[PDB]
Design a binder for this molecule. Structure first.
Ligand SMILES: Nc1ncnc2c1ncn2[C@@H]1O[C@H](COP(=O)(O)OP(=O)(O)OP(O)(O)=S)[C@@H](O)[C@H]1O
Lengths: 172, 156, 56, 254, 100, 156
């Protein structure tokens, strides 16, 4: 059982080494979008990185297009694969992992994960192992869900509060 | 010197840097509405629990672990079952509720360490100590204070 | 700004005119604070509040 | 009239403020020539005196139960039943009457129009109601206009069972201002939100004042019952009945 | 089961876990315990429904969870008692006083 | 000296400390309504039994015991089945609460050692001896007496 664990850790290195450069990179951004400047657990990343790796293994076997040639096809493929892979596994989400990946798909703010600072890491020759949160530059504030969420406060509750009236409390 | 009065003076005259240690401790403790009993809750549609979720298969997890040149990871039975039962009555309501305002409110609460239907004051560790925030008083100007200024030094 | 709702199509803007401003014109006409020949000049106070400055 | 309605009916005076001032606009020149005066949507929990307001306005504003016009919406649950409102079209069975409701408004234009329970009707019945709250341009089978000016269109419907006020007031306090006031509006917003779910939100724009009634408990119920005995004082005297109530006489009932 | 589902730390945001753990054992007790003579599913229903689990995370209680004690060392003596106004028994008594 | 008369004097004149041993024993025994036959019970909606419950799986319990880096503990089939049947044959019969009051009454009875539909007098061990309480006469001032004063010494 440790020997079988070793080869199937090797089989993500002999094949799949090009996607896990783009995969771990899109996961470092995703943990920042889910958590957003709070202390992340270094131990249960590993439980959820294995589910995210199995999303990218499942998508890259379904694509004839290259990852470097057309990268956003994979973000629509990988995030939706783990929008459902987290939903069929994670029962309770206190950090709302299924719920936030819902709104990254529905609001299309994942286009910032593929940008001119971000396309340089995925082209470069770094093993997945070496892709750390320090290697990933942070998105600007406008591209975190926080800012977008807070921008949905302001809109709705400026108008949700203008839902209806006390009708006579208003004096002159 | 009192918990309630200082936040009325934060806009007017004095900043956050000149408060006492016992004043910063008091402003991060919860208000008097905490400890006051109120057994009322509502809108039990939380995005925390997933109704489509299932157990670990332990045969699929064995199969997905060996990297097996496979084409799909999840099970897709219970997540197509929830898609079918959603389509049963065309959704006059919810084709555009529950995909909008109730989602972004509960997401912003999860960044503050607040549960989804939780109407009361909730802690979150900022630096070395805890700050009790709620939906109503977000205490955002304190979180800007105890993250920025309290990088190197200690406050209680 | 107190009753802006485009989804309801700006009928609540006119209900808010009818149910608030016109109702004070109806109550203050029964009791004799409004003579039949009075000019009405509604203006906001910038003090959280509405006031109507009656003019003759 | 604001004082006299506060006599027979106790709770929800903010609805009464919206109700009485519509009469104040009608009594003066503050009249809307198109819109019928006093359209309302009376949502609330089951058991409170929602339809009772239409009885009191007929007894006070019109001095007679004849100006009360009940519409039993349980008769109008079917999609075919909508022709019973406006009468049968020409060339069919009937057509001599202009309808059940539409004929009766023609001889009494100054009358309240009670709709009993809008929760049980087909949505085709709601389609005629769009014009009813909207204008007085309602045509018969002979296409004559019916004057729904000066008609107070009271439309109670429960939806009490479903949710909001359905949640039983957790604290049966009279009114906690920092609590009750805040939570009630959150459920009322939901009630309005639900309407978009079913009453087809065009109909919501025609409403002048949706009013959520507060559910009764021990504080409120203690005050109601003595007036019901005063209703026994007025009706059952002359044959000489004059009851009295006590501290224990109400506590035994609650 | 909850800590494998959370990227947030436990010390960083503690009430997310109380909503996660109690609801996990609001259902884990419900699928296992058939008869509840002590009403274990029924009381965890009302701790969620009345949100009086916010007192389990307080200034006396955040000191134990930060401190370096292994979980085997934690006894009922190390955990200080909640005040009587916070517990479910006075909540259930004050409720029946108000409703009756 | 009689069981019924002493509790009418507890408010007026005499306290609980001056009773006889045979008087404290008699006041904790059940009343004369106990032994009187009354074969009728109602409202068989108890929170004691869970209709969503199932057997021990013995394969899941094997899997959850090995700590298995798993993501869900319970089975969630019968507890989603009860959620589905509540939304379908219940929404016709529209919503019901069952917590606005029937929950908190049955919870307070379980602190007194009383079953949920049990309208009669029920024992609970206080210190060394038993005290028969019911829904109707909670005997709360005795429980304050036999817990506080009977810490160190013995009473029967
Ligand atoms: N606020 C109140 N003022 C006066 N009487 C009231 C009040 N609330 C309830 N009642 C009395 O309680 C009864 C209320 O009747 P209604 O509830 O109006 O009938 P209903 O409205 O069709 O009831 P629901 O809610 O639709 S089942 C009558 O006997 C009223 O006299």
């Amino acid at each position: 059982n440790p020997f079988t664990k070793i080869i199937h850790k090797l089989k993500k290195f002999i094949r799949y080494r090009k996607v896990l450069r783009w995969s771990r990179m899109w996961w470092v951004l995703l943990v920042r979008e889910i958590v957003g400047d709070n202390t992340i657990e270094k131990k249960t990343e590993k439980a959820l990185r294995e589910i995210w790796d199995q999303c990218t293994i499942a998508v890259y076997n379904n694509t004839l297009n290259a990852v470097e040639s057309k990268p956003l096809l994979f973000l629509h493929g990988i995030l939706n694969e783990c929008r459902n892979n987290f939903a069929t596994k994670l029962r309770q989400d206190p950090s709302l992992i299924v719920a936030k990946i819902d709104q990254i798909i529905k609001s299309q703010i994942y286009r910032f994960w593929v940008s001119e600072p971000y396309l340089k890491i995925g082209r470069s020759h770094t093993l997945y192992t070496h892709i750390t949160p320090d290697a990933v530059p942070q998105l600007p504030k406008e591209c975190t869900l926080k800012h977008l969420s807070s921008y949905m406060e302001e809109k709705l509750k400026s108008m949700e509060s203008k839902k209806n009236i006390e009708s006579g409390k208003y004096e002159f | 010197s009192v918990k309630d009065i200082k936040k009325l003076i934060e806009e007017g005259i004095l900043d956050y840097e000149d408060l006492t240690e016992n004043e910063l401790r008091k402003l991060a403790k919860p208000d008097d509405n905490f400890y006051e009993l109120s057994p009322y809750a509502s809108d039990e549609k939380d995005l925390s629990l997933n109704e489509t979720s299932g157990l670990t298969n332990e045969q699929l997890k064995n199969f997905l672990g060996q990297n097996g040149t496979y084409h799909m990871s999840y099970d897709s039975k219970s997540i197509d079952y929830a898609k079918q039962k959603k389509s049963e009555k065309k959704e006059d309501q919810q084709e555009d509720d529950d995909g909008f305002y109730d989602a972004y409110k509960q997401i912003k609460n999860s960044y503050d360490g607040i549960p989804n239907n939780f109407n009361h004051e909730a802690p979150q560790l900022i630096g070395n100590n805890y700050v009790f925030t709620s939906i109503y008083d977000t205490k955002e100007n304190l979180i800007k204070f105890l993250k920025k200024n309290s990088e190197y030094d200690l406050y209680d | 700004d107190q009753s802006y709702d485009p989804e309801l199509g700006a009928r609540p803007t006119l209900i808010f005119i009818e149910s608030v401003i016109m109702t004070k014109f109806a109550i203050m006409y029964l009791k004799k604070e409004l003579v039949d020949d009075m000019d009405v000049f509604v203006d906001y106070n910038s003090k959280a509040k509405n006031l109507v400055i009656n003019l003759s | 009239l604001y004082n006299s309605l506060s006599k027979s009916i106790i709770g929800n005076e903010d609805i009464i403020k919206s109700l009485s001032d519509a009469v104040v606009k009608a009594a003066t020149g503050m009249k809307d020539p198109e819109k019928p005066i006093g359209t309302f949507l009376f949502l609330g929990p089951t058991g409170v005196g929602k339809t009772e307001l239409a009885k009191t306005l007929a007894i006070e504003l019109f001095n007679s139960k004849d100006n009360l016009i009940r519409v039993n919406m349980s008769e109008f649950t079917e999609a075919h039943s909508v022709s019973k409102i406006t009468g049968s079209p020409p060339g069919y069975v009937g057509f001599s009457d202009s309808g059940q409701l539409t004929e009766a408004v023609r001889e009494k234009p100054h009358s309240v129009v009670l709709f009993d329970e809008l929760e049980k009707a087909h949505a085709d019945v709601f389609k005629v109601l769009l014009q009813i709250l909207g204008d007085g341009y309602i045509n018969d089978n002979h296409r004559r206009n019916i004057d729904f000016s000066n008609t107070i269109i009271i439309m109670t419907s429960n939806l009490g069972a479903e949710l909001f006020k359905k949640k039983l007031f957790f604290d049966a306090d009279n009114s906690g201002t920092p609590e009750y006031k805040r939570v009630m509006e959150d459920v009322r917003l939901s009630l309005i939100k639900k309407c978009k779910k079913v009453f087809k939100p065009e109909f919501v724009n025609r409403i002048d004042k949706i009013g959520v009634f507060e559910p009764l408990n021990k504080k409120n119920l203690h005050k109601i019952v003595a007036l019901r005995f005063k209703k026994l004082e007025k009706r059952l005297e002359e044959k000489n009945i004059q009851v009295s109530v006590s501290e224990k006489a109400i506590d035994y009932i609650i």
